[PDB]
């Protein structure tokens, strides 16, 4: 709720990075601090992580994408965000029992 950056800017940055500017190889995962770094966005360090670790795990288990600062610095110092997991909000199946066939964005790209 207290994200110090305008929302749609971060979403555009994530999409552009994965929009074939890095995904000419269908099997490349956009994660980590090397590949999933939204360099163009700069924000000051927050006084609290925002997403408590108890909540980060739940979001990842429910098919959401969570991002956080790329480097640890004192409060108020500028940093950049990066993406933890690349997931496609996919759970269950038409045939109702669950699986993780399309749990990763790379799976959709590879299937195509």
């Amino acid at each position: 709720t207290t994200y110090p950056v305008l929302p749609y800017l971060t979403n555009a940055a994530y999409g552009a990075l994965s929009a074939c500017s890095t995904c000419e190889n269908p099997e490349l995962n956009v994660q980590g601090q090397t590949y999933g770094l939204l360099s163009c966005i700069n924000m000051p360090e927050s006084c609290t992580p925002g997403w408590e670790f108890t909540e980060v795990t739940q979001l990842q288990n429910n098919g959401f994408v969570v991002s956080g600062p790329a480097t640890t610095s004192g409060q108020g110092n500028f940093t950049s965000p990066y993406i933890y997991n690349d997931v496609t909000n996919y759970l269950r199946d038409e045939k109702n029992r669950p699986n993780a066939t399309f749990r990763d964005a790379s799976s959709r790209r590879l299937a195509a």
């Binding site: 609290t48 670790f53 610095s73 004192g74 409060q75």
Partner: protein, 286 residues
């Protein structure tokens, strides 16, 4: 034309530059909270450190001194020690390095005001029993006695003594740079003491037998000294009440240490003039 402003060399024209922005951060920006959490970045990275480094939380206790906040599910790790080191450096710099720089300049000294005066070899002319006879029949801090005048040494309160000494140091520092002994420059030298010279004669003069001057108060408050690196100083009163201090009744109702100090400086400066006179006038707070 331009508007002149007082200066050490007389009346000059002042100006300003354009902001550059290449100044290193000062003691003021040194914040305990930000510095403490900063050392979490000096630790290595891996599965044994990611979770601990992510959950770092810092809060300020009663008297500042940011301390780590242990929630109900804290997992002890070296990360707690790293934050502790952060608090240490922020504290030691404030206690150790900041006072050293603060006391190194006459325009910012706080605790070592008395020591600085001893560096200037300053001696007051109103406290020696064998004062110069030209200093007047009875000085403001002398009461007549059958065996000639006698002076009384005042024990000023702490706050007024600190402010008065600080003001004196500033004026003495300015005078050591050398000046041309004209009215405009002298007023600037002693202005920290909140005193202004003003001649009595208004006609042409230069032929009369004596030249007379008097001292006027420019304000009723010294500008105090601030310990912290940020914030304005706290003003203090420049006068002292005779009755409150329980001094002999023969003394004047109000005593101004700044005026006495300023009078000594000017008298020494213009000693070579053989027809210089001072006519002090009683002054009261508004």
């Amino acid at each position: 034309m331009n508007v002149l402003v007082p200066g050490i060399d007389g009346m000059v024209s002042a100006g300003k530059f354009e902001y550059s922005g290449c100044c290193p951060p000062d003691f003021a920006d040194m914040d305990e909270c930000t510095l403490a959490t900063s050392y979490v970045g000096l630790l290595p990275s891996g599965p044994l450190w990611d979770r601990a480094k992510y959950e770092a939380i810092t809060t300020i206790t009663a008297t500042g001194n940011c301390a780590a906040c242990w929630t109900e599910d804290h997992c002890p790790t070296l990360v707690d020690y790293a934050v502790n080191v952060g608090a240490r450096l922020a504290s030691v710099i404030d206690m150790t390095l900041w006072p050293a720089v603060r006391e190194s300049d006459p325009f910012t000294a706080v605790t070592s005001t008395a020591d600085w005066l001893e560096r200037f070899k300053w001696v007051n002319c109103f406290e020696t029993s064998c004062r110069s006879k030209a200093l007047g029949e009875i000085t403001p801090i002398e009461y007549m006695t059958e065996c000639g005048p006698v002076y009384v040494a005042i024990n000023y309160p702490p706050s007024i003594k600190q402010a008065f000494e600080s003001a004196l140091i500033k004026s003495l520092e300015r005078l050591s740079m050398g000046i041309i002994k004209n009215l405009a420059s002298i007023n600037f030298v002693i202005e920290p003491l909140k005193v202004r010279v003003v001649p009595l004669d208004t006609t042409n003069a230069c032929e009369n037998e004596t030249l007379c001057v008097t001292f006027e108060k420019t304000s009723d408050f010294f500008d105090g000294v601030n310990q912290n690196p940020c914030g304005i100083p706290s003003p203090v009163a420049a006068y002292i009440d005779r009755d409150v201090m329980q001094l002999p009744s023969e003394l004047p109702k109000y005593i101004w240490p700044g005026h006495m100090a300023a009078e000594c400086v000017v008298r020494s400066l213009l000693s070579h003039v053989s027809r210089f006179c001072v006519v002090r006038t009683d002054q009261t707070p508004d």
